[PDB]
Amino acid sequence: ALLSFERKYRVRGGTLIGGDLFDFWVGPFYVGFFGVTTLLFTVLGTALIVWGAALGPSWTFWQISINPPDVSYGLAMAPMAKGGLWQIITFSAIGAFVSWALREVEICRKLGIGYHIPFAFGFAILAYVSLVVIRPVMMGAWGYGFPYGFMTHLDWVSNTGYQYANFHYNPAHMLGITLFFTTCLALALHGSLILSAANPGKGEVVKGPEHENTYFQDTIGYSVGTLGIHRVGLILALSAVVWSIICMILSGPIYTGSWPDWWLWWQKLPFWNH
Amino acid sequence: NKGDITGYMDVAQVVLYAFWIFFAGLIIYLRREDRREGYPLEDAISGKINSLQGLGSVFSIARPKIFKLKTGATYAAPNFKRDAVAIKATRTAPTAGAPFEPTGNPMTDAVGPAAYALRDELPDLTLGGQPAIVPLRVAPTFSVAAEDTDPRGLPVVDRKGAVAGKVTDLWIDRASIAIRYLEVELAATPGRKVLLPFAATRINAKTKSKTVTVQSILARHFANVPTIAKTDSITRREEDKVMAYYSSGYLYSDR
Amino acid sequence: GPIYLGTTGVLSLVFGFFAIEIIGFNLLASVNWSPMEFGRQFFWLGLEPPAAEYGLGFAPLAEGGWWQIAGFFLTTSILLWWVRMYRRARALKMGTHTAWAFASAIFLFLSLGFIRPLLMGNFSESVPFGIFPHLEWTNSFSLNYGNFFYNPFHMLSIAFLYGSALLFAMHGATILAVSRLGGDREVEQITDRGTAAERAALFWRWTMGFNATMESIHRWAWWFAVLCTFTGAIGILLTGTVVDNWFEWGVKHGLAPAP
Amino acid sequence: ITEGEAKEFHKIFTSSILVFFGVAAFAHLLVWIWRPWVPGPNGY
Amino acid sequence: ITEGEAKEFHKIFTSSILVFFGVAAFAHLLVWIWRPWVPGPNGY
Amino acid sequence: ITEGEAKEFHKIFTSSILVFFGVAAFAHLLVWIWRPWVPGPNGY
Amino acid sequence: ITEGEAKEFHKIFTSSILVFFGVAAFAHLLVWIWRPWVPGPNGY
Amino acid sequence: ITEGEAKEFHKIFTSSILVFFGVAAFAHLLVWIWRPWVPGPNGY
Amino acid sequence: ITEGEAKEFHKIFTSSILVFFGVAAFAHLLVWIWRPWVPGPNGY
Amino acid sequence: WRIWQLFDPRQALVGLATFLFVLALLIHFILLSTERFNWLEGAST
Amino acid sequence: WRIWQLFDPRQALVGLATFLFVLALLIHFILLSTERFNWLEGAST
Amino acid sequence: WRIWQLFDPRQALVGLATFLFVLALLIHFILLSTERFNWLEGAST
Amino acid sequence: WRIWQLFDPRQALVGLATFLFVLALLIHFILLSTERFNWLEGAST
Amino acid sequence: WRIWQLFDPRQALVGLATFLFVLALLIHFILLSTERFNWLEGAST
Amino acid sequence: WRIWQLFDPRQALVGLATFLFVLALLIHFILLSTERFNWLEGAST
Amino acid sequence: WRIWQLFDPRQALVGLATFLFVLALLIHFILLSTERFNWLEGAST
Numbered sequence A: 001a002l003l004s005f006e007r008k009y010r011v012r013g014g015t016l017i018g019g020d021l022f023d024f025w026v027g028p029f030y031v032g033f034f035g036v037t038t039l040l041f042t043v044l045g046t047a048l049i050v051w052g053a054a055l056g057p058s059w060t061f062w063q064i065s066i067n068p069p070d071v072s073y074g075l076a077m078a079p080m081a082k083g084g085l086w087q088i089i090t091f092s093a094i095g096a097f098v099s100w101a102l103r104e105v106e107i108c109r110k111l112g113i114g115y116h117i118p119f120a121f122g123f124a125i126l127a128y129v130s131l132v133v134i135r136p137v138m139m140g141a142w143g144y145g146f147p148y149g150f151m152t153h154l155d156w157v158s159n160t161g162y163q164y165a166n167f168h169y170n171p172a173h174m175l176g177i178t179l180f181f182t183t184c185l186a187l188a189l190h191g192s193l194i195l196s197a198a199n200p201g202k203g204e205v206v207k208g209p210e211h212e213n214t215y216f217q218d219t220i221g222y223s224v225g226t227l228g229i230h231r232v233g234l235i236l237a238l239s240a241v242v243w244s245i246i247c248m249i250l251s252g253p254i255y256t257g258s259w260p261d262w263w264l265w266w267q268k269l270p271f272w273n274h
Numbered sequence B: 001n002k003g004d005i006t007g008y009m010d011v012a013q014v015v016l017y018a019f020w021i022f023f024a025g026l027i028i029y030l031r032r033e034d035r036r037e038g039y040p041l042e043d044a045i046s047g048k049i050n051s052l053q054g055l056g057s058v059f060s061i062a063r064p065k066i067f068k069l070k071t072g073a074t075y076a077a078p079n080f081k082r083d084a085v086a087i088k089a090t091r092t093a094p095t096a097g098a099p100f101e102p103t104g105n106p107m108t109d110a111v112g113p114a115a116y117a118l119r120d121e122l123p124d125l126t127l128g129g130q131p132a133i134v135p136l137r138v139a140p141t142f143s144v145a146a147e148d149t150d151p152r153g154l155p156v157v158d159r160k161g162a163v164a165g166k167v168t169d170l171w172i173d174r175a176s177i178a179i180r181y182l183e184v185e186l187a188a189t190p191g192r193k194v195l196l197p198f199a200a201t202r203i204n205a206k207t208k209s210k211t212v213t214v215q216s217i218l219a220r221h222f223a224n225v226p227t228i229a230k231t232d233s234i235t236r237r238e239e240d241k242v243m244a245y246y247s248s249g250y251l252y253s254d255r
Numbered sequence C: 001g002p003i004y005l006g007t008t009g010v011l012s013l014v015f016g017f018f019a020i021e022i023i024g025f026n027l028l029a030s031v032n033w034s035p036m037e038f039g040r041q042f043f044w045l046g047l048e049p050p051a052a053e054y055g056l057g058f059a060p061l062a063e064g065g066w067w068q069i070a071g072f073f074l075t076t077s078i079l080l081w082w083v084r085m086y087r088r089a090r091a092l093k094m095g096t097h098t099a100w101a102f103a104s105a106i107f108l109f110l111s112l113g114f115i116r117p118l119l120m121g122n123f124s125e126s127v128p129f130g131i132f133p134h135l136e137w138t139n140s141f142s143l144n145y146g147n148f149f150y151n152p153f154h155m156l157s158i159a160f161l162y163g164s165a166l167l168f169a170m171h172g173a174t175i176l177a178v179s180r181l182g183g184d185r186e187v188e189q190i191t192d193r194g195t196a197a198e199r200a201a202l203f204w205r206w207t208m209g210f211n212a213t214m215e216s217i218h219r220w221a222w223w224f225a226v227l228c229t230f231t232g233a234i235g236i237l238l239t240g241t242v243v244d245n246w247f248e249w250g251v252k253h254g255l256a257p258a259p
Numbered sequence D, E, F, G, H, I: 001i002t003e004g005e006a007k008e009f010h011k012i013f014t015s016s017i018l019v020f021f022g023v024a025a026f027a028h029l030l031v032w033i034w035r036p037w038v039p040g041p042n043g044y
Numbered sequence J, K, L, M, N, O, P: 001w002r003i004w005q006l007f008d009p010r011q012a013l014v015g016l017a018t019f020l021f022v023l024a025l026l027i028h029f030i031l032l033s034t035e036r037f038n039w040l041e042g043a044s045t
């Protein structure tokens, strides 16, 4: 099935690799060679996750967990019953994410638009890789990656954040929190303004950029613009992800001590050291 | 037995399930709002209204909402105004999911990245009712910031180094202050002027001329840029046509 | 710049300024009026809420009374700011979506500061005014009430926060991608659908099977942002009042194996 | 794409796939001689 | 891209992959005298 | 841009990669005299 | 970028980098007399 | 900036640099007489 | 922006900076009389 | 033979080479995981 | 004297005043922090 | 030559360089990870 | 003398002064951190 | 010599310098990590 | 001996001085991190 | 005497008054902090 305006855009070309073989659609989904690879990796990883659930002790969705190999294994590939399944799932997921991003690139090429969307998804892929590959590799063992479970990855988050006394005192983690809260606040403001301009109340006429700028100027003192707000939102989300990656790289590969104790330098400054 | 509703049920679980019900209803409503443009779905080949849908099709498409405009006209969403089934392209395979192959010149035929939406033949209007996008000649009040470089008089060059023309005017937006289009006088056929989107043009910094580089299309494609009826105002349809023609360069420039 | 305050803005500014002055004066008095010690311990300084024995009444000034006064003034200022952003939208003949999205954040703020202490009978577990004091309040709240990770409404609030970040990273990237087709003129696209909106919808359809419109994506964003704080406020209210241990609740409801 | 280019491609393709499979078979035979990978009833 | 420049490519490309494989083989051979990397029946 | 200018680049490019490689090799020789990095049967 | 002014850069750049390297060599020599950084078989 | 302007900047700039270096050298000499910063064999 | 006015600005700037430096020097002499800030080898 | 007319030589060969390389790397890593076929840290049989 | 034609004596003076005040405040705060030179809380010499 | 008439090195040279360098780096890191072939530590046999 | 032809003399002066001041401040703070060269709270050699 | 027309003779130099410098830094840090080749600490053989 | 036609002299000189300064700062901090070469603290040979 | 042509008398006075008020408030806060000079509490000498 097609939309009322899709046939004129469903054109040949735009593939990065594979040529005409995979240039076709199955329903609404564009397939592509990287889509075929995405399906390959998704099916493999999902089947192996269900296999790990079957090997596990419970079939409860919350309690299903695929655990990484023990820290004693180091960076060596582990037996499939002792974390090798986790490693295979990790690399299949990485392949699936990369293939999804490249499929988005192919769709962007076909539609003649920018690559900002795959570029932004690259940051999510980078955060995932840093959590499952980069940080455990610089830490010396695959056991430091989070287990693939609904609750066990939360337990991993809790244990990792309490290994450093209090993760709330990580300076890059504070910046990540600030940018994550600001992204939500800005999203609420942007959606609210656009919906208030498009729906100005029953019996009223749709407003425009003048009114949109005037509203926020009158309320808070300044505005950003029509495209400045989208650029700011993208930069905010990507900066939050980047500072989260930075805090995770600092926590354990570089800094191993207590983050609350890291803040003594502020109290030891020469102009206040009494 | 603090929060227990029954032997196993409790207040937190009851509130969680209430939120689940509300969130399912909210997803239904959000999809309803999503289906205000482009729906109902048409068959890929025949173009008749036909799709694989369940018992939720009754609630799927909402009643048309009416947007009241300051010009007195109204826009309905969904408007149920479909594009023409026949387009200037032919599928490479008889399957529904097969892609289309342009019959002639895709840039002129407006298929694929060159395709544009049949918007209203009316220019965007500001709060005062005057057209929003006008050349700098018609708007003496506006001026380019002194910290920036005026694109007027700067050569227009493509990705291969071929010069397409010179910038003779700038088209501004009065509603949201910005530069929208650049008026370029083509080197070939002197006196012919074409509109050039600002968002598709980057300045080449220190070139001693700051050539306004256009990576979209080549120099030879500037002669085929769609024209505009008025010399001081541009309609929404012409605007889309120009942006769509320029956006198709990355895919059909070397073809 | 051209900030319109009005009567409601004047009220809100006066109330919030009184609250800020009270908080700052208390912080500076905590270090015996030392500018040096204030700079040294600014993060660690805080204005703590009254103890549990005072209930909801007025505690002595040196023992939480200043906190109660500052908190009430801040709450009044925030409510008057909500009224202000409602009235500005009404005056500009626009919708009150901004006011009703701010209402969710106000609901969460009241749940953290006033509503939950009202339910519990005292202000002892309210949020103190200070950077590190309120971070420590967060940590101690989670630690005392089991594990907040096991709160389902905390789960939902985190999911909607991640969804807000994900949705803005999608929407900004999409609008920048179609910015060369006039996609930044979102209301104009809503009123008269253009090739920018068409290509954005088609990209997302070809990517993940379904798409939104130029208005409904903002509806998605608005609802995600509101639901973050709404679910979080519900979780805060249910924490301790009906569930004393979220880990034990999760164990009972299958979120974790029984110890 | 032309018939002659396709014939040359098929000729080199069958030669290369035969040499690839021969190298793989020789490697597998050497690895089997070194340490076989089929366990016995009682293990290795 | 002309076919003559493809001939030049092919030429120096094969002449360089030959040197690359030669130096790789020499390095592997030297490492083989240093410490062989195929364990025997009793390991190392 | 021009083939002649590319050749003129390549001339001093090889003449400079030569001196870079010579400095690297001389430094490696000095480090080898200081402490060799190839362990013996019993280690270092 | 004119060739003559570019050559004048090259000349003065070479003189300045030579001065910088001479000063760095002097400093490294002084540090070598102070405490050498190359350990012997028995260390420092 | 004109050639004469550049030359004027240059001469008085090096004139001011010489005084700065002299003052820094005098201060460092005074600090050295106060407490030298280069430890001996056994230390300070 | 103009030479004569800038010259007289330098005149009054010197007349002010000399007074400022004299006041600072007198204050530093008084502070040195009160408590010197250069510890000896045994400290203060 | 005509299968190389239905299948582009370049597009087929690039995909085949990438697939073979990934499969070989996966098999080699799986072998490194075990104890019998770990040729680097060779263990006694 | 040449300085004042290139550097505006309205911005140079303001920058100098702010920088000097900041430096003086910093040095005074350092002296207050130190024990020997804290004149407000006089300790042993 | 006919092979490179279609596999022109517009970016294949960069692809091959990136592949070879990464493979060499991975093999070297694996050797460093192993004890027998760690030339920097030089454990006895 | 051509360094001022390439670089604005005003900007060069401003950047050089700022860099020198920051470097001096950093070195002074490092000396204060060190026990031997802390001239304010001086310790015996 | 035609590879200098194939690749930008500016980006090529920049990328090569950035690659060689990063490789050198990595190798030097690895040597610092090793006990035998740590010239700063200088352990005995 | 004509690199400066390829690279802008100003950007080259504002990118090669920063690199050298950062490298010098890093090496000085590394020396401070070692007992032997720390001239501020001071230890035995 | 020429300062009121160079600097704006309306902005200069406001800035000076704000600076003086901030300095006076800071010094009074420091005095309140000190034990000897806390006139409100009045510690014995």
Ligand code: 07D
Pocket: A097, A124, A125, A127, A128, A131, A156, A157, A158, A160, A161, A162, A166, A167, A168, A173, A176, A177, A180, A240, A241, A244, A245, A248, C138, C139
């Ligand atoms: C002691 C407990 C403790 C503690 C007191 C405390 C406090 C707080 N913290 Mg923290 N934290 C603690 C623990 C701790 N903290 C985190 C992290 C963070 C982040 C990162 C968010 C992000 O960017 O996610 C980025 C997200 C990723 C990883 C994106 C990856 C996703 C991809 C590729 C896509 C996957 C797609 C599929 C599988 C397909 C789906 C298919 C279909 C639907 C069909 C961040 C901003 C953040 C939030 C808060 C706040 C607001 C608070 C409050 C309220 O106090 N914390 C670190 C991290 O992940 O960094 C990357 C991390 O690991 C770690 C630890 C150990």
Ligand code: 07D
Pocket: A157, A158, A181, A184, C020, C023, C074, C078, C105, C106, C108, C109, C112, C129, C137, C138, C139, C140, C141, C142, C143, C148, C149, C154, C157, C158, C161, C228, C229, C231, C232, C233, C235, C236
């Ligand atoms: C041990 C620590 C711990 C822990 C291990 C863990 C885990 C994680 N959590 Mg959690 N959390 C912990 C504890 C804990 N958790 C929070 C909450 C959240 C949020 C906040 C949402 C928000 O937007 O807040 C932000 C909104 C607020 C607080 C309300 C908006 C405020 C308004 C309008 C007032 C306007 C202000 C002024 C006018 C200025 C006044 C001036 C002056 C006072 C001077 C959220 C989504 C979230 C995120 C994470 C993640 C991602 C993680 C990871 C990765 O570890 N957590 C709870 C809540 O209900 O949130 C709504 C809550 O209260 C609470 C507690 C105590």
Ligand code: 07D
Pocket: G023, G027, G028, G030, G031, G034, H021, H024, H028, H031, H037, H038, M020, M021, M023, M024, M025, M027, M028, M031, M037
């Ligand atoms: C505790 C005492 C101490 C201390 C251990 C120390 C070390 C050294 N300072 Mg000094 N200095 C100390 C105190 C202090 N200092 C100055 C400053 C400055 C400036 C002036 C700017 C300039 O352009 O100088 C002009 C720069 C020149 C002269 C560059 C020439 C460099 C040469 C020929 C090579 C240097 C290396 C050696 C000679 C190695 C021999 C070592 C051994 C035998 C063991 C600057 C770069 C500079 C150089 C150095 C040097 C060469 C040394 C060596 C190697 O002894 N010092 C700061 C300043 O004014 O910054 C703008 C500042 O405020 C401040 C303070 C507090």
Ligand SMILES: CC[C@H]1c2cc3[nH]c4c(c3C)C(=O)[C@H](C(=O)OC)c4c3nc(cc4[nH]c(cc(n2)[C@@H]1C)c(C(C)=O)c4C)[C@@H](C)[C@@H]3CCC(=O)OC/C=C(\C)CCC[C@H](C)CCC[C@H](C)CCCC(C)C
Pocket: A038, A041, A042, A043, A044, A045, A046, A090, A092, A093, A096, A097, A100, A104, A117, A118, A120, A121, A123, A124, A147, A148, A149, A150, A153, A237, A238, A241, C162, C163, C165, C166, C169, C170, C173, C207, C208
């Ligand atoms: C970087 C900024 C934000 C961002 C952006 C972003 N995400 C994106 C995009 C963008 C721009 C897309 O275009 C793309 C998309 O199409 O979304 C609809 C996407 C996307 N990001 C998603 C989710 C997501 N994004 C997140 C976050 C973020 N992404 C950032 C906050 C998060 C979290 C945790 O905060 C999640 C959960 C998806 C909706 C989509 C990814 C689609 C995809 O990868 O498809 C290919 C893969 C599959 C269909 C399934 C693969 C299954 C694997 C084989 C197994 C994986 C297992 C896993 C490792 C663990 C699972 C258990 C967990 C409980 C631990």
Ligand SMILES: CC[C@H]1c2cc3[nH]c4c(c3C)C(=O)[C@H](C(=O)OC)c4c3nc(cc4[nH]c(cc(n2)[C@@H]1C)c(C(C)=O)c4C)[C@@H](C)[C@@H]3CCC(=O)OC/C=C(\C)CCC[C@H](C)CCC[C@H](C)CCCC(C)C
Pocket: A181, A182, A184, A185, A188, A189, A192, A219, A220, C012, C013, C014, C015, C016, C017, C020, C077, C078, C081, C082, C085, C098, C099, C101, C102, C104, C105, C225, C226, C228, C229
């Ligand atoms: C949907 C949930 C998200 C959200 C949304 C949200 N927040 C919002 C809004 C929305 C939709 C607004 O519309 C509103 C706003 O205006 O945003 C710009 C706001 C807002 N939320 C804010 C912040 C905020 N949002 C946060 C987060 C979030 N809110 C969530 C992520 C957070 C955190 C903790 O993450 C914070 C801290 C504010 C910036 C703003 C509300 C402003 C407000 O209430 O101000 C009250 C007024 C004062 C304190 C007065 C101060 C006066 C000064 C002292 C100046 C001097 C005045 C004068 C001199 C006084 C007179 C003196 C005489 C009497 C002597």
Ligand SMILES: COC1=C(OC)C(=O)C(C/C=C(\C)CC/C=C(\C)CC/C=C(\C)CC/C=C(\C)CC/C=C(\C)CC/C=C(\C)CC/C=C(\C)CC/C=C(\C)CC/C=C(\C)CCC=C(C)C)=C(C)C1=O
Pocket: A182, A185, A186, A189, A190, A191, A193, A194, A212, A213, A216, A220, A221, A222, A223, A224, A225, A226, A229, A232
């Ligand atoms: C279609 O497009 C649309 C527009 O366009 C037409 C728009 O416009 C907008 C509107 C969006 C914006 C205008 C910006 C959106 C971007 C962000 C949210 C990220 C950037 C975050 C900020 C700068 C915070 C801005 C929030 C304000 C101004 C709220 C105003 C509240 C009051 C006036 C009440 C009293 C103020 C208080 C109590 C604090 C308010 C917060 C700040 C002013 C910032 C925090 C500052 C401090 C507490 C200390 C720092 C002090 C400063 C900054 C002064 C000293 C200088 C320094 C640098 C330190 C949208 C959404 C939009 O869809």
Ligand SMILES: COC1=C(OC)C(=O)C(C/C=C(\C)CC/C=C(\C)CC/C=C(\C)CC/C=C(\C)CC/C=C(\C)CC/C=C(\C)CC/C=C(\C)CC/C=C(\C)CC/C=C(\C)CCC=C(C)C)=C(C)C1=O
Pocket: A026, A027, A029, A030, A031, A035, A036, A038, A039, A040, A042, A043, C166, C167, C170, C171, C172, C174, C175, C197, C200, C201, C204, C207, C208, C209, C210, C211, C212, C213, C214, C217, C220
């Ligand atoms: C300008 O405003 C904008 C809008 O627009 C106007 C918008 O819209 C949006 C977009 C935003 C919305 C629509 C709002 C909602 C978005 C969110 C809330 C974000 C969260 C998103 C989700 C929760 C949805 C996630 C769903 C995903 C990731 C899709 C999953 C898809 C797959 C798993 C398959 C992908 C398809 C492939 C690879 C091919 C097709 C596959 C099939 C049809 C099934 C299998 C098919 C076969 C068996 C036959 C073919 C098989 C082959 C080829 C062999 C394969 C071999 C195997 C067996 C493996 C934005 C941002 C925007 O700002």
Ligand SMILES: COC(C)(C)C/C=C/C(C)=C/C=C/C(C)=C/C=C/C(C)=C/C=C/C=C(C)/C=C/C=C(C)/C=C/C=C(C)/C=C/CC(C)(C)OC
Pocket: D001, D004, D005, D006, D008, D009, D010, D012, D013, D014, D016, D017, D020, J009, J016, J026, J027, J030, L002, L003, L006
């Ligand atoms: C146009 O042409 C001109 C004129 C220019 C001439 C040019 C000619 C050219 C370029 C000729 C080139 C020919 C070449 C290079 C041919 C190469 C052929 C090769 C190498 C073919 C290889 C084929 C291999 C295949 C198909 C292997 C398939 C194996 C599979 C699918 C095995 C799967 C195994 C599984 C799933 C099991 C795994 C077990 C483990 C343990 C890994 O599971 C966990």
Ligand SMILES: COC(C)(C)C/C=C/C(C)=C/C=C/C(C)=C/C=C/C(C)=C/C=C/C=C(C)/C=C/C=C(C)/C=C/C=C(C)/C=C/CC(C)(C)OC
Pocket: H001, H004, H005, H006, H008, H009, H010, H012, H013, H016, H017, H020, K002, K003, K006, M009, M013, M016, M020, M026, M027, M030, O021, O024, O025, O028, O029
């Ligand atoms: C255009 O010109 C006209 C015509 C108008 C003429 C007018 C001319 C005028 C008015 C000119 C003005 C001239 C003036 C006032 C010039 C002043 C010049 C000065 C003071 C120059 C000083 C230069 C200093 C330099 C270059 C010093 C550099 C030092 C460096 C890089 C030191 C680095 C040290 C390191 C990295 C040490 C680190 C050690 C530790 C341990 C700290 O590292 C961790």
Ligand SMILES: COC(C)(C)C/C=C/C(C)=C/C=C/C(C)=C/C=C/C(C)=C/C=C/C=C(C)/C=C/C=C(C)/C=C/C=C(C)/C=C/CC(C)(C)OC
Pocket: K021, K024, K025, K026, K028, K029, P009, P013, P016, P020, P023, P026, P027, P030
């Ligand atoms: C239309 O009207 C016309 C123009 C016709 C006439 C109008 C005439 C008018 C409006 C005339 C008004 C004249 C007025 C009101 C003039 C005011 C003059 C005053 C009050 C001047 C005062 C100046 C004070 C100065 C410059 C003080 C400088 C002090 C400094 C920089 C001290 C710094 C101390 C430090 C850094 C150390 C502090 C110690 C601690 C312990 C705090 O350090 C941490």
Ligand SMILES: COC(C)(C)C/C=C/C(C)=C/C=C/C(C)=C/C=C/C(C)=C/C=C\C=C(C)\C=C\C=C(C)\C=C\C=C(C)\C=C\CC(C)(C)OC
Pocket: C020, C021, C023, C024, C025, C027, C056, C057, C058, C059, C068, C069, C071, C072, C075, C109, C110, C112, C113, C114, C126, C127, C128, C129, C130, C131, C134
């Ligand atoms: C010029 O003066 C200046 C501006 C320099 C003074 C300086 C001010 C400063 C530095 C202010 C800010 C200081 C800091 C560090 C503030 C940080 C605040 C933070 C991070 C607060 C975070 C959370 C606090 C929350 C969520 C508290 C909410 C409390 C509420 C809602 C309390 C409500 C209380 C009520 C309604 C009381 C009711 C009882 C009544 C009074 C009705 O009867 C007993």
Ligand SMILES: [Fe+3]
Pocket: B037, C189, C190, C191, C193, C197, C213, C214, C215
């Ligand atoms: Fe629309």
